From a paper:
Recognition of peptide-major histocompatibility complexes (pMHCs)5 by the clonally expressed αβ T-cell receptor (TCR) mediates T-cell immunity. Here, we used a well characterized [name]+ T-cell clone (ILA1) that responds to residues 540–548 (sequence, ILAKFLHWL) of human telomerase reverse transcriptase to further investigate the structural basis of TCR degeneracy. Here, we solved the structure of the ILA1 TCR in complex with [name]*0201-ILAKFLHWL (A2-ILA) and several previously defined APLs. Combined with biophysical analysis, we demonstrate the molecular mechanism for antigen discrimination by the ILA1 TCR and model the mode of cross-reactivity with these APLs.
To investigate how these ligands adjust TCR interactions to tune affinity, we solved the structure of four APLs (A2-ILA3G8R, [name]; A2-ILA3G, ILGKFLHWL; A2-ILA8T,ILAKFLHTL; and A2-ILA8E, ILAKFLHEL), included our previously published APL structure (A2-ILA8R, ILAKFLHRL), and used the ILA1-A2-ILA complex as a model. The overall conformations of A2-ILA3G8R, A2-ILA3G, and A2-ILA8R were virtually identical to A2-ILA with Lys-4, Leu-6, and Trp-8 pointing up and away from the MHC binding groove and Leu-2, Phe-5, His-7, and Leu-9 acting as primary and secondary anchors, indicating that a molecular mimicry mechanism underpins ILA1 TCR recognition of these APLs. For both of these ligands, the extra flexibility, afforded at the N terminus of the peptide by the substitution of Gly compared with Ala, may enable the ILA1 TCR to establish enhanced contacts with peptide residue Lys-4. This represents a likely mechanism for the stronger affinity, supported further by the observation that all of the other APLs that did not include Gly at position 3 were bound by ILA1 with weaker affinity compared with the ILA1-A2-ILA interaction. In fact, substitution at position 3 with Gly could override the negative impact of modifications to peptide residue 8, revealed by the enhanced binding affinity of the ILA1-A2-ILA3G8R interaction (KD = 1.0 μm) compared with the index peptide (KD = 34 μm) and ILA8R (KD = 151 μm).
Numbering used by the authors:
A (entry chain A): 1 to 276
B (entry chain B): 0 to 99
C (entry chain C): 1 to 9
């Protein structure tokens, strides 16, 4: 299957309360493998998966230097954007950055990303071509022009198509048992009488990896989204995920309805039906 | 400024069996800004020994966190998750339902 | 691994 490496950064200003909170996390696919937190004790980049613990002190020292430099960057960014938007010193603001790379089944480069939000909305992003920028407004045009003169896109393109992909392959080899697995969902159905006239059917998918899954209800063979409820896919806390989808149906007509489950670990999609 | 109210799910790691050790989870997702208060409650009293995941975010820049604690459910004990966020006019308390 | 990135907005 295809794979990704993504780094996520969040800097939050603290008016009257000192230095910003900064939190950085790194993922391969849906598995977290590193963090840095300004609130934590070590002030180092730290392991969060077993397979990365065997990297030596040169790796940790390097990652620590860089992540601290990313922290200082976003500390300055908070002040810069406050100035661009002429915002008061009174309020807390947020800068977020994500970057990383996708590779196909051949483990060859497919796509790269490097993008920012300010207070929860897009600010600037590197376009899919890795040569040009999308600026959300007139403030972000200032940053776009700056980054064009400093050839930021060229630098990012080199990392994204090179270093990013190289290390993602290294991590997939060395985290093999964890990262290259597929755990198919364990499925079942539950039922609640709502009244004499209605019932709820709930179709469950449990203990699956990776997180990507599709749960759909049909009635007589037809996709049915009226009177359905689909919860966000959620972590179990052991490395797997969970999801459910429910439908409210008229009493006695439960046999019309089918739950369909699609997942990488299932060689054929599953159909579930409820019987009394 | 974007503000988004949290989605809150309270559930167990494994199917619940009275008298068998397990993890109680409170997953809060889809929120903005990042400042959030999350407590797990046992019969209305906060549980101290609760762990949480490292702040992360989705494609739409909204945040998510998992808070979790080791527990052994019984028929008698009631569990809940209490959430406070700037988008809430008062804290939200979501009771554990064993089929959700 | 992280990028060796120093660019500011």
């Amino acid at each position: 299957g295809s794979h990704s490496m993504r780094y996520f950064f969040t800097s939050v200003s603290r008016p009257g309360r000192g230095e910003p909170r900064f939190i950085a996390v790194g993922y391969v696919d849906d598995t977290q493998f590193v963090r840095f937190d300004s609130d934590a004790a070590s002030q180092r980049m730290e392991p969060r998966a077993p397979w990365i613990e065997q990297e030596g002190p040169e790796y940790w020292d390097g990652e620590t230097r860089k992540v601290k430099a990313h922290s200082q960057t976003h500390r300055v960014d908070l002040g810069t954007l406050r100035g661009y938007y002429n915002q008061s010193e009174a309020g807390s603001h947020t800068v977020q950055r994500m970057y990383g790379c996708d590779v196909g089944s051949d483990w060859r480069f497919l796509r790269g990303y490097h993008q920012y939000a300010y207070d929860g909305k897009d600010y600037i992003a590197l376009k899919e071509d890795l040569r040009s920028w999308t600026a959300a407004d007139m403030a972000a045009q200032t940053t776009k022009h700056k980054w064009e003169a400093a050839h930021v896109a060229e630098q990012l393109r080199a990392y994204l198509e090179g270093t990013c992909v190289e290390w993602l392959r290294r991590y997939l080899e060395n985290g093999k048992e964890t990262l290259q697995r597929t755990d198919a969902p364990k499925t079942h159905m539950t039922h609640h009488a709502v009244s004499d006239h209605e019932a709820t059917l709930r179709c469950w998918a449990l203990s699956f990896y990776p997180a990507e899954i599709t749960l759909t209800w049909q009635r007589d063979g037809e996709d049915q989204t009226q009177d359905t409820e689909l919860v966000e896919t959620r972590p179990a806390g052991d490395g797997t995920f969970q999801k459910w989808a429910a439908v409210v149906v008229p009493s006695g007509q439960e046999q019309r309805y089918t739950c369909h489950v699609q997942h990488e670990g299932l060689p054929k999609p599953l159909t579930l039906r409820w019987e009394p | 400024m974007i503000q988004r109210t949290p989605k809150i799910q309270v559930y167990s790691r494994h199917p619940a069996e009275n008298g068998k050790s397990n993890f109680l989870n409170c997953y809060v997702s889809g929120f903005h800004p990042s400042d959030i208060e999350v407590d797990l409650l046992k019969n209305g009293e906060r549980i101290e020994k609760v762990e949480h995941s490292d702040l992360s975010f989705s494609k739409d820049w909204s945040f998510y966190l998992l808070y979790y604690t080791e527990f052994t459910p019984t028929e008698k004990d009631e569990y809940a998750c209490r959430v406070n966020h700037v988008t809430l006019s008062q804290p939200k308390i979501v009771k554990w339902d064993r089929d959700m | 691994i992280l990028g060796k990135f120093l660019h500011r907005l």
